[PDB]
Design a protein around this ligand. Sequence first.
Ligand SMILES: Cc1cc2nc3c(=O)[nH]c(=O)nc-3n(C[C@H](O)[C@H](O)[C@H](O)COP(=O)(O)OP(=O)(O)OC[C@H]3O[C@@H](n4cnc5c(N)ncnc54)[C@H](O)[C@@H]3O)c2cc1C
Ligand SMILES: Cc1cc2nc3c(=O)[nH]c(=O)nc-3n(C[C@H](O)[C@H](O)[C@H](O)COP(=O)(O)OP(=O)(O)OC[C@H]3O[C@@H](n4cnc5c(N)ncnc54)[C@H](O)[C@@H]3O)c2cc1C
Ligand SMILES: [Zn+2]
Ligand SMILES: [Zn+2]
Lengths: 488, 488
Amino acid sequence: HRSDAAVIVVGAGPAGMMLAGELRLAGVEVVVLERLVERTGESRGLGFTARTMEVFDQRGILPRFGEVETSTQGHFGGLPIDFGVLEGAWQAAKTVPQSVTETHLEQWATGLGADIRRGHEVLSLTDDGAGVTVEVRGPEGKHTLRAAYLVGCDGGRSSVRKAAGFDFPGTAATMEMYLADIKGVELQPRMIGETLPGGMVMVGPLPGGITRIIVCERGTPPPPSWHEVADAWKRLTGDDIAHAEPVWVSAFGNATRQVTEYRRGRVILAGDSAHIHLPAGGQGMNTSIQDAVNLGWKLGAVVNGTATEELLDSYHSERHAVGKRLLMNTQAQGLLFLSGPEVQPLRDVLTELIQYGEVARHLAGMVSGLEITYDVGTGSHPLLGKRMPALELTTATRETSSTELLHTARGVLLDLADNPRLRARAAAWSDRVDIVTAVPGEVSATSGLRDTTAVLIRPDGHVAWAAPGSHHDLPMALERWFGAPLTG
Amino acid sequence: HRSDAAVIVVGAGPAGMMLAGELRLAGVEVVVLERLVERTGESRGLGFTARTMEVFDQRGILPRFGEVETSTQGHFGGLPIDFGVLEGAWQAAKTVPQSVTETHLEQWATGLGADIRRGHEVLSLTDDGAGVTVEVRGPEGKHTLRAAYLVGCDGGRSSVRKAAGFDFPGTAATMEMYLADIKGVELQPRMIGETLPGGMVMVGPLPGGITRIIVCERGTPPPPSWHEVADAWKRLTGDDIAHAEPVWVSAFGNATRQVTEYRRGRVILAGDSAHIHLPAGGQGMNTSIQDAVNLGWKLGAVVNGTATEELLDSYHSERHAVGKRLLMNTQAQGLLFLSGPEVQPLRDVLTELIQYGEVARHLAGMVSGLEITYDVGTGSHPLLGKRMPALELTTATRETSSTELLHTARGVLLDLADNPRLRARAAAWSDRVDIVTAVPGEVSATSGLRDTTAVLIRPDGHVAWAAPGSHHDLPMALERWFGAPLTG
Ligand SMILES: Cc1cc2nc3c(=O)[nH]c(=O)nc-3n(C[C@H](O)[C@H](O)[C@H](O)COP(=O)(O)OP(=O)(O)OC[C@H]3O[C@@H](n4cnc5c(N)ncnc54)[C@H](O)[C@@H]3O)c2cc1C
Ligand SMILES: Cc1cc2nc3c(=O)[nH]c(=O)nc-3n(C[C@H](O)[C@H](O)[C@H](O)COP(=O)(O)OP(=O)(O)OC[C@H]3O[C@@H](n4cnc5c(N)ncnc54)[C@H](O)[C@@H]3O)c2cc1C
Ligand SMILES: [Zn+2]
Ligand SMILES: [Zn+2]
């Protein structure tokens, strides 16, 4: 297989596998180097957000998952919120283990022709502005690979970040917590957590008679034996579970850091390699998958020569902003979860505020990722920069949807008012952008789609331009996200 | 003067002086015992809330103050909020020193015939269910006084609370802060506070070239020399102010406690004696004055024999609830003010939430006291249990207002639709309740007064009943707050 690719991805976690699939959709030759021979089989995370559900759906990935339980029951820092107040938030997957999601993403990417090389550890890396050479240890021993670009999707302790000179400011961990998947004992469920006099606790069932416990005890300084975790449980809850059978026991911290640059030269980061934090609020995997979704189409266009690196710079500006918000979100939730009775007054105030619809929707927007808004220029149209909500469509020949039209990761221009001029203005981008004339289905008052005659949708599903109500014109938007018009 | 009164009040702070005046309005003989010969001349507090302004106005107290600067600029935990989003919140006094407010309340109460005995310290107290005897040291030496009821308005370190067996649960102080009024140096104002890397700081001007500083430095364990306060300033701000002239230097803490019972037998508490907390958010004096306003008319009715002690029990239930909220409010604000960078994520979330009108109004309601709602029974009418907003009124003979009609601290029944039956239904309470037929002025959509035909207003200004939309009937409300109907 040896020696060259267009893009090398380090790491086959959720970020790397989603990225690999996205690059394949862009027609890019991609090699993934993963040190592990076999998926860790972990599933620290359970379920995924409504926005993650949507980014899967828009690539036609969901049938791989079969029937998936969804839920509108949410929380913020353990404060319950009905996320059903926010349109589309219902799409959150409740229970799917991270290992299962990873499996489907790997199978998808591989099916698309990603060259995934397991048992290959990147030991080091080099970048001169022509390319990136990595040294790798595989089954064949030590060897080198070179590509135009290298993406570190190699996790919170990223070799790539360390080697490629990224600055990683933030705060050092101040506490160690535990999780344990266990058998034998039946415990009273606490799906959104339980505030205790000396900390916090989560309890929940998993298939095969497994109970998952999350143990966050007061005053613990930052692989754990089961009995210290049991001892932590006993002190917190008063209940002895030392007799249980430990399936998996793990430790984690609250170190919170983010790279100042998502790209240095030809070396880019996506996922935990760019941002680490307390895993509070079910955000890390979701954000990491979504980093890859932002990146893949852009890096693909650059590799394909259809876009300049101005486009590539927008991965940094858009995702650094999301990552900053991620750190705020998780730190805020962590404070509410983990601080003692001291923080109760603030829990109580926030609880009162949650009773207002705008607050419930605000927090739901933050947790679900449905709030995410990119700078695509100004205008009155409510959807600018936001994700395109699912929209049913009837064309001259078929019934389809915005979601389905995104399966090939192209741009999509919806002509919702049969305007042939619109079709002609954009025809110079028709090699990169599918121009679809359709009658739209019924849309809600709050969807942002009422009275909309046209929408330009980026390959990631975000709205770049809409009519009416964009200050920038359509060709400006097409040029910004798709590059130069075709020469007639 | 010696030996007897109907009610003895211990302490001539804001609570005791407001209470004394309220009892006089009820026609009650009241003796106030205050240990200090001369007002401390302190003014820890500056200005007062919109609700305090209203409770002064409704007794015709305001002319004593002359022209008073008001402001809509508020904050919650140092997060700025335009309180102007909430009707009536504009009435907050910005700068009036606590010592000035105390002076006017003392002059008012004395003018009304309160017997205030300064240099009289209550050393001890006794209660058998017939009365309360106190031993007192005055200029004449040691002597005893007896009355039907005793009210401890004797501050955070209440002798009365300690002696009368009140339970005072809460949390012990965990930090010591400083304040200093100083001359000589001109400092950049920070009227709502300034978050620093090692704490928080407030700076503001006062008449006579005085700058007030509030110094809350990281890691200080719970009379201070000026130079330790200057040293605290220097470490926090980097600025040397040791050369300044200290006018007053004071220490305070964040001990947060509340009595479980506002009344035990014939011994009642009002003010700091019932509740202590961090003085964050300008709440203590305001709540203490407002405790007295709740109590005075009720205790007066009991002394006058027109009400039973069920009425007296409602002082506990109503004000314990307000005091609980006070502890929540001040603790929440204190956390936001005083915690390090660690709490920044929560400041940032709350800042986003404050941009929603319902949130801004919610927080403004809490800080101003305009939110305060008592259990007076159920119904759809929006004002039940809440304060009566100022309402202009034209009667057959005069132009008046709800505010003016409350000057004598009687009940007020507003007949806003010329309904003579209403007048007859309530006539049996006309000895205690002024029944006023009037054409109401213009009222706002949000005042709660639109389409209101009648309102029963308690002597404290709270709405007990309204038409339409009360589940309880008018006689039920009259009986509940005013006692038995007159026998024809
Ligand atoms: C207790 C816990 C609970 C969590 N719960 C949730 C949740 O509920 N929801 C949610 O969204 N997120 C959750 N997360 C976060 C989530 O698991 C991570 O954010 C996610 O795994 C990050 O994905 P990634 O692809 O960026 O990195 P990883 O998943 O860590 O993948 C990194 C990969 O790179 C490989 N690698 C490293 N170095 C090299 C090298 N030199 N050469 C080749 N390969 C290399 C590693 O073997 C690894 O497979 C949780 C995390 C924890 C710890
Ligand atoms: C630094 C600081 C800033 C503050 N800022 C504000 C603010 O901005 N806004 C606000 O609303 N509040 C503020 N407060 C709170 C406010 O000052 C108090 O809540 C208020 O003084 C309480 O009033 P009181 O009548 O209940 O008790 P006090 O004002 O303390 O009155 C108690 C009186 O009882 C007397 N006494 C005690 N024992 C006896 C006895 N045995 N016999 C006779 N007399 C006795 C004392 O001499 C005293 O005069 C602040 C407090 C501090 C410390
Ligand atoms: Zn190989
Ligand atoms: Zn005397």
